[PDB]
Amino acid sequence: XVQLXXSGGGXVQXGXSLXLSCXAXXXXXXXXXXXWXRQXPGXXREXVXXXXXXXXXXXXXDSXXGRFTXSXDXXXXXXXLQXXXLXXXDXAXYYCXXXXXXXXXXXXXXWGXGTXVTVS
Amino acid sequence: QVQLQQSGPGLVKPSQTLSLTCAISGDSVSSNSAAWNWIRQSPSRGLEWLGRTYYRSKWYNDYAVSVKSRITINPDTSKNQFSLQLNSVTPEDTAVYYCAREVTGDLEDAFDIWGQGTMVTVSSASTKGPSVFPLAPSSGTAALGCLVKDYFPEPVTVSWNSGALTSGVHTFPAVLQSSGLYSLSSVVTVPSSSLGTQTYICNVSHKPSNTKVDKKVEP
Amino acid sequence: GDIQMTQSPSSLSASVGDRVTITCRASQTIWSYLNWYQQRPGKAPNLLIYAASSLQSGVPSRFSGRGSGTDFTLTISSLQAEDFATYYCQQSYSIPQTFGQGTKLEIKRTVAAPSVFIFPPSDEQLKSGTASVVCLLNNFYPREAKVQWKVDNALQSGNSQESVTEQDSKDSTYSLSSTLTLSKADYEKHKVYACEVTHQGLSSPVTKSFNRGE
């Protein structure tokens, strides 16, 4: 059983910044990739970024490359998404998910409840 | 006997066009004592009249102001049907859409015949068909069922023994899982004595994905 | 809209055999141009009464309607279990035609404590990498209940969801499902799975449990 809790969402104007956090409880995040996704009303749940295990790198979606940065703090069992140079199109609920597959296939069994980001 | 049969996809991408069709049996789309209506229903806004088409020596339309700039309701006399076209949809258009016959006569102005409804979800996500797993009866009355997991969009329907089993069936409303996909279960209680001799098969249908699956549920 | 239809009460519970009357008021006069509908779960609204007081063909005679102008009523003379439904009024006086917000009629009945069942995940689901553990509370009344998951005798939170049926049209009960979802790896890290059920009709909670792999 894993419980994920996102926070750090809110309202910002274009060009602004936010930092999201995703705190995990009940298993270590150290052994698994952690991903960020986002969903705006009417749209598919879109991949944003993944932080794999330490030394296995971070990867990003085209839409956020060079503006968002994913990072991990294994000791705090928490991952972060630094979001810079925000634009209206970034408005969405942001979700974190743990990849249950050690091989990084993205078996996303556990999802957070989401935190709302609005850029206006 | 007058019947209305609805058809059309229940998934529409944002900014694209919703298109549904209502085929009439037992009456004429040109009847001068009826009007052919579309009404939608959502949890947030209730029942909302959308518009109508009707023939009185000439074809007429009335539309709700809020959708008039996007809506078209046209008859097809050759096929004896009428259509709904709603352009540039947004999530505010997610709803169950019904067609209905409005009797318009001396003693009555009412919606007396309704289509079965089409659940329309405005989303750019792709369809996903469900997986069906058994809820096996445990080792008097016994409970068994089927778990219908990970589908999109709504709805799925479930029957038991191709409709022959109805007593004691409970099919739960779908739940939106944290992944954004839906699941539901359907259960039935039966005599525990009946387990080794009677067969129980759940029939699962997910029309958006053209999925049909039977699952025998055994101890 | 333009003419607003306001129904009252928004919901109510009444017992089989009760006389039930619900009210629909129009924001301006609609004379006789008022209809009543019954909507059962999963179904289109069904016309009960047209022109304020005319009973639609095939509708049981226990249904009746009265009124004119701005104030209308719908009456069920002797409620039956299958009358569980949402009831709507609708004006056809002028465009746009508009509906009331509905009256949700629950059938009140005697208290029935739930029968509880627990289901382990299927082998096929486990093969796919996930485990769904299902707890079923069957045929109970009233609707309120508490379902807690205990895994290896430890209370859980955050990995379960519930769904409740609409009221049954024959015995007026509810059923409820609680589903605990784990990854396959996590499911295989525990032995005892238990569902604990509390309901006003139970003197103390009821638990159903299984040991994984038995």
Author numbering:
A (entry chain K): 1 to 120
B (entry chain H): 1 to 35, 35A, 35B, 36 to 52, 52A, 52B, 53 to 82, 82A, ...
C (entry chain L): 0 to 213
Relevant lines from the article:
It has been classified as an inhibitory coreceptor for the B-cell receptor because of its function in establishing a baseline level of B-cell inhibition.
The antigen–antibody structure was solved by molecular replacement using the m971 Fab as an initial search model, which was derived from its 1.6 Å resolution crystal structure in complex with the crystallization chaperone anti-kappa VHH domain. Comparison of the variable domain of the CD22-liganded and -unliganded crystal structures of m971 Fab indicated that its paratope is largely preconfigured for binding its epitope (RMSD of 0.33 Å).
